[PDB]
């Protein structure tokens, strides 16, 4: 806020009820900003595709049961959110977040044993 | 440049002191016994796009084999021309030897 546009002072969560509000607050800001993110970096994907990525990022950490670890993830989310909504990231940075735009594909690991073996460890 | 003795034998004996001290890891060396059994290099490369021109190799060499010539006018069209192998470096020493000996002659008392 005061230092720069989307700056959030680093604070610990008081309890699990406090943490959950921040996590939902963080998700709400992210998926709300998805229309702006598309037109601001000229992303060649629909807001639906972008918003799915937001949920998966939040779902990788759905099973965390440690309060200190949540505070770390919340601070990372605020830092990524600020550097996105401020035009500090470049199209290369945001585009790299979408795993489909790598010339070797998104399925960058072998499907099963025999496809990886026939190609040579993937 | 890579230098010779007055007889024309290579000064380099593959000690690897210049490869170890190099602050930028610009030198790559391979070596075995030569056909006559002499300790000599088979590969002596300097990546001139990694080299920071600090003189540490020239300071570390016990035989005065690797030296920096006074030459600075060798800008190239392609980056590949700045990957010096042993042939390029020994040719440089052959061409620049009278300067190399004169520069060594003047400063060796301080080295």
């Amino acid at each position: 806020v005061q230092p720069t546009k989307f700056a959030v002072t680093v604070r610990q969560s008081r309890n699990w009820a406090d943490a959950k509000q921040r996590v939902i607050a963080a998700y709400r800001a992210w998926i709300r900003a998805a229309p702006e993110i598309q037109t601001m970096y000229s992303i060649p994907f629909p807001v639906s595709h972008i918003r799915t990525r937001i949920r998966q990022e939040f779902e990788r950490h759905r099973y965390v049961n440690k309060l200190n670890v949540v505070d770390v993830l919340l601070q990372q989310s605020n830092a990524d959110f600020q550097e996105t909504m401020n035009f500090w990231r470049q199209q290369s940075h945001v585009m790299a977040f979408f795993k489909e735009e790598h010339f070797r594909g998104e399925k960058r690991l072998p499907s099963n044993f025999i496809t990886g073996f026939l190609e040579g460890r993937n | 440049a890579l230098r010779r003795y007055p007889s024309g034998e290579e000064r380099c004996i593959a000690c690897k002191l210049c490869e170890a001290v190099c602050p930028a890891q610009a030198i790559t060396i391979e070596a075995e016994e030569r056909a006559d059994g002499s300790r000599r290099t088979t590969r002596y490369d300097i990546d001139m796009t990694k080299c920071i021109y600090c003189g540490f190799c020239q300071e570390s060499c016990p035989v005065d084999a690797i030296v920096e010539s006074p030459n600075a006018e060798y800008a190239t069209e392609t980056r590949e021309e700045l990957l010096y192998n042993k042939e390029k470096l020994l040719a440089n020493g052959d061409k620049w030897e009278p300067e190399l000996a004169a520069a060594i002659r003047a400063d060796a008392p301080y080295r």
């Binding site: 998966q56 990788r60 950490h61 099973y63 965390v64 049961n65 440690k66 670890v69 770390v72 993830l73 990372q76 790299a96 977040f97 795993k99 790598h102 070797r104 998104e106 960058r108 690991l109 072998p110 499907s111 099963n112 044993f113 990886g116 040579g120 460890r121 993937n122 | 790559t28 590969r43 490369d45 590949e80 990957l83 192998n85």
Partner: protein, 154 residues
């Protein structure tokens, strides 16, 4: 599923053709263990690869034991991508970003604790210890009641 490889793990931007398929990625729900590997920023690959935890043996070429004092953590070399010959210069290229990295620990519980916290697979190699036997100079000159059996030369 009892050491089954999870062929459906999400990839990250450092996932390459040389990355092995992991078994167990941290989720932040493991009991009693800080999930550093979840928040470190390190690629998924480091939870798929195995580190070796060992005391380096004394070199056979020297008597100094300075480098055997500490515990070493090292990454095993993969089948593909560790080294190959660059066609231009003959240099040795690598796709293994861990090839020149090692970690030093005062005790192996420390090394194990760090490895569990990051989520590395690890293998602990215990150090072989010398078997003590007293040595005496005077044993070079023991009286032989019988055939000498060996002729000593100082």
């Amino acid at each position: 599923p009892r050491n089954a490889p999870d062929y459906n793990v999400p990839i990250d931007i450092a996932t390459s053709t040389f990355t092995p398929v992991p078994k167990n990625v941290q989720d932040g729900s493991e009991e009693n263990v800080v999930p550093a590997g979840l928040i470190s920023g390190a690629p998924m690959e480091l939870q798929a690869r195995t580190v070796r935890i060992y005391k380096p043996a004394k070199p056979a070429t020297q008597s100094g034991e300075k480098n055997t004092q500490l515990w070493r953590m090292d990454w095993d070399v993969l089948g593909k991508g560790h080294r190959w010959e660059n066609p231009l210069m003959g240099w040795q290229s690598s796709a293994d970003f861990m090839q020149g990295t090692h970690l030093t620990f005062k005790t192996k519980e420390d090394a194990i604790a760090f490895a569990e916290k990051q989520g590395y697979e690890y293998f602990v190699q215990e150090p072989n210890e010398r078997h003590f036997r007293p040595k005496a100079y005077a044993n070079n000159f023991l009286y032989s009641p019988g055939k000498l059996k060996h002729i000593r030369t100082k």
